[PDB]
Design a protein around this motif. Structure first.
Motif, short mmCIF file in Angstrom:
data_model
loop_
_atom_site.label_atom_id
_atom_site.label_comp_id
_atom_site.label_asym_id
_atom_site.label_seq_id
_atom_site.Cartn_x
_atom_site.Cartn_y
_atom_site.Cartn_z
N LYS A 195 0.86 -1.21 0.00
CA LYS A 195 0.00 0.00 0.00
C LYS A 195 0.89 1.25 0.00
N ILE A 196 1.79 1.34 0.93
CA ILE A 196 2.69 2.53 0.97
C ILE A 196 3.46 2.62 -0.35
N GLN A 197 3.75 1.49 -0.95
CA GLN A 197 4.49 1.52 -2.25
C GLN A 197 3.65 2.22 -3.32
N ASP A 198 2.41 1.85 -3.46
CA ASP A 198 1.55 2.48 -4.50
C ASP A 198 1.28 3.95 -4.15
N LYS A 199 1.37 4.32 -2.90
CA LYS A 199 1.10 5.74 -2.53
C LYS A 199 2.42 6.51 -2.38
N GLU A 200 3.32 6.02 -1.59
CA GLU A 200 4.62 6.74 -1.39
C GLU A 200 5.66 6.32 -2.44
N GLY A 201 5.38 5.32 -3.23
CA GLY A 201 6.38 4.90 -4.26
C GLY A 201 7.61 4.27 -3.59
N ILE A 202 7.47 3.77 -2.39
CA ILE A 202 8.63 3.14 -1.70
C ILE A 202 8.52 1.61 -1.82
N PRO A 203 9.57 0.93 -2.23
CA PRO A 203 9.55 -0.56 -2.37
C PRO A 203 9.60 -1.28 -1.01
N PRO A 204 9.19 -2.52 -0.99
CA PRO A 204 9.17 -3.35 0.26
C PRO A 204 10.57 -3.72 0.77
N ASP A 205 11.51 -3.93 -0.11
CA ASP A 205 12.88 -4.33 0.32
C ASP A 205 13.60 -3.18 1.02
N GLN A 206 13.02 -2.00 1.06
CA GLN A 206 13.72 -0.85 1.71
C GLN A 206 12.84 -0.21 2.80
N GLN A 207 11.55 -0.31 2.71
CA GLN A 207 10.70 0.32 3.77
C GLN A 207 10.49 -0.68 4.91
N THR A 223 -1.77 3.25 14.62
CA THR A 223 -0.73 3.99 13.85
C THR A 223 0.57 3.20 13.84
N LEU A 224 1.24 3.17 12.72
CA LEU A 224 2.53 2.42 12.63
C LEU A 224 3.64 3.39 12.23
N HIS A 225 4.88 2.98 12.38
CA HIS A 225 6.01 3.87 12.00
C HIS A 225 6.74 3.27 10.80
N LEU A 226 7.13 4.09 9.86
CA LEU A 226 7.85 3.56 8.66
C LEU A 226 9.32 3.99 8.72
N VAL A 227 10.22 3.04 8.64
CA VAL A 227 11.67 3.37 8.70
C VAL A 227 12.31 3.05 7.34
N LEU A 228 13.03 3.98 6.78
CA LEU A 228 13.67 3.72 5.45
C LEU A 228 14.98 2.96 5.64
N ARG A 229 15.27 2.05 4.75
CA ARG A 229 16.52 1.26 4.85
C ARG A 229 17.62 1.99 4.06
N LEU A 230 18.43 1.27 3.33
CA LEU A 230 19.51 1.94 2.55
C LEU A 230 19.37 1.56 1.08
N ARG A 231 19.15 0.31 0.79
CA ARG A 231 19.01 -0.12 -0.63
C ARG A 231 17.69 0.41 -1.19
#
Lengths: 32, 74
Positions: B29-41, B66-74
């Protein structure tokens, strides 16, 4: 003294677990 | 049940989900909205890392949660 990137907010950061906090700070420090 | 996702920049997103929805789906869901992939979020709830092999009800997540989203590096 803590420095946060132009895309990181402090309110949501302190809400994250310490273990993840350290990993994110260590990344801002290795490059910082 | 819906859930709010606040990012590291304070971006809040409301995504409708279900008690049997898998963490891998919410991440999409966050991918289709924020454009962030699963292997990094990364999604964290109560200091606990959600697993891609479990359901929201398994983590005791309820509506308006409510949940928190942390960005990875790849």
């Amino acid at each position: 003294k803590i420095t946060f990137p132009s895309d990181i907010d402090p309110q949501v950061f302190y809400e994250l677990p310490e273990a993840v906090q350290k990993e994110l700070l260590a990344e801002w420090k290795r490059t910082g | 049940m819906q859930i709010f996702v606040k990012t590291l920049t304070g971006k809040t997103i409301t995504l409708e989900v279900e008690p049997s929805d898998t963490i891998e789906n919410v991440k999409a869901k966050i991918q289709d909205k924020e454009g962030i992939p699963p292997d990094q979020q990364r999604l964290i709830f109560a200091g606990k890392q959600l697993e891609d092999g479990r359901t929201l009800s398994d983590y005791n997540i309820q509506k308006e949660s409510t949940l928190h989203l942390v960005l990875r590096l790849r």
